[PDB]
Enzyme design. Sequence first.
Site, PDB file in Angstrom:
ATOM      1  N   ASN A   8       0.838  -1.158   0.009  1.00 50.67           N
ATOM      2  CA  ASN A   8       0.010   0.202  -0.102  1.00 50.67           C
ATOM      3  C   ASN A   8       1.076   1.106  -0.241  1.00 50.67           C
ATOM      4  OD1 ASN A   8      -1.634   2.194   0.865  1.00 50.67           O
ATOM      5  ND2 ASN A   8      -3.055   0.891   1.420  1.00 50.67           N
ATOM      6  N   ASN A  10       0.494   4.495  -0.230  1.00 46.56           N
ATOM      7  CA  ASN A  10      -0.145   5.527  -0.004  1.00 46.56           C
ATOM      8  C   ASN A  10       0.214   6.901  -0.663  1.00 46.56           C
ATOM      9  OD1 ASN A  10      -1.222   7.215   2.439  1.00 46.56           O
ATOM     10  ND2 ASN A  10       0.784   7.623   3.216  1.00 46.56           N
ATOM     11  N   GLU A  36      -4.094   2.232  -2.962  1.00 53.51           N
ATOM     12  CA  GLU A  36      -4.197   3.418  -2.616  1.00 53.51           C
ATOM     13  C   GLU A  36      -3.152   4.174  -3.456  1.00 53.51           C
ATOM     14  OE1 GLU A  36      -4.349   3.589   1.463  1.00 53.51           O
ATOM     15  OE2 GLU A  36      -4.686   5.890   1.586  1.00 53.51           O
ATOM     16  N   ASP A 149      -4.946  -4.540   1.036  1.00 55.44           N
ATOM     17  CA  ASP A 149      -5.381  -3.897   2.194  1.00 55.44           C
ATOM     18  C   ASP A 149      -6.773  -4.292   2.820  1.00 55.44           C
ATOM     19  OD1 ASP A 149      -5.685  -2.369   4.746  1.00 55.44           O
ATOM     20  OD2 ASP A 149      -4.794  -0.687   3.712  1.00 55.44           O
ATOM     21  N   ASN A 151      -7.878  -4.081   5.441  1.00 56.37           N
ATOM     22  CA  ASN A 151      -8.329  -3.143   6.716  1.00 56.37           C
ATOM     23  C   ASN A 151      -8.913  -3.849   8.028  1.00 56.37           C
ATOM     24  OD1 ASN A 151      -7.393  -0.318   6.421  1.00 56.37           O
ATOM     25  ND2 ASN A 151      -8.766  -0.295   4.380  1.00 56.37           N
ATOM     26  N   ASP A 246       3.340   4.249   5.023  1.00 55.39           N
ATOM     27  CA  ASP A 246       2.990   3.880   6.393  1.00 55.39           C
ATOM     28  C   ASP A 246       2.722   2.428   6.476  1.00 55.39           C
ATOM     29  OD1 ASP A 246       0.695   4.429   4.922  1.00 55.39           O
ATOM     30  OD2 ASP A 246      -0.560   4.933   6.634  1.00 55.39           O
ATOM     31  N   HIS A 247       2.539   1.994   5.331  1.00 51.74           N
ATOM     32  CA  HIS A 247       2.428   0.378   5.113  1.00 51.74           C
ATOM     33  C   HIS A 247       3.897   0.002   4.628  1.00 51.74           C
ATOM     34  CE1 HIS A 247      -1.975  -0.198   5.223  1.00 51.74           C
ATOM     35  NE2 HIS A 247      -1.925   1.181   4.961  1.00 51.74           N
TER      36      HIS A 247
END
Length: 259
Positions: A8, A10, A36, A149, A151, A246-247
């Site tokens: 991911n 971001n 994303e 992801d 989530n 951040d992933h």
Amino acid sequence: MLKIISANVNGIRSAYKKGFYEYIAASGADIVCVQELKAQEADLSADMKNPHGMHGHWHCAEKRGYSGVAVYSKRKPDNVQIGMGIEEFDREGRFVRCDFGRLSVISLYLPSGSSAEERQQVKYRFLDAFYPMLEAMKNEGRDIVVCGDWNIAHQNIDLKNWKGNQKNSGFLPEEREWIGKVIHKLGWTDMWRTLYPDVPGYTWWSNRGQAYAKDVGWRIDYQMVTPELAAKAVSAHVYKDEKFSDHAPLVVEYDYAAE
DNA sequence: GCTACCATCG
DNA sequence: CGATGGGTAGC
């Protein structure tokens, strides 16, 4: 000799200026599933469409700088499916499928419901509409990897403080056992947990406080594999030498042959 | 600016 | 436990 990565990014542009493009080649990955994008078709450069000569297929959202997933591959997919087939989630671009004969890989960005209650509900309709979709794919009788992801953290071992997040989105009971049903009832294999039943293997860390530094993270990035292929997995790793997001990229290997 | 996306303090 | 406040990418 197959190697699949799920990252991911971001925002793919940010990741690209943070060294992700070089990583795509360096990792030696055959197939890279990204989620994303935070970008549209017009926002993409040539390198963000076909990195290092790899083929690529994406699905972007209507609005700009939001969601979007893609699949890159050293080989040309003999088939490509954009979107799941439902308006409500396809207007957000959260699904890409690529068929390479017997193999079938999917980049998926499951909706987050931590922004608001209504988002949580859209997430639930997504689960209820994507559930039968997972079932169909299992009954296709082919090797399928679903990277992305989700989530959702499955169990207590899948996140550092599972005590404070039992009332928060991503670790709600009905979510947890929705995943539980995906793993047991349908027979999908949560590859990481199957390879290493006692390793946390966090793939995401919040921006808050010292989350990343103290390793207070979540494992919400998955590669759901079919059994006959799941049994061919040889190893897996969470790349954190470099930080593109951040992933963290989820790398999985398969003793496979395309012939 | 605004929008979308739970660790930390008391 | 519950109440309280966040950094980041892109528009």
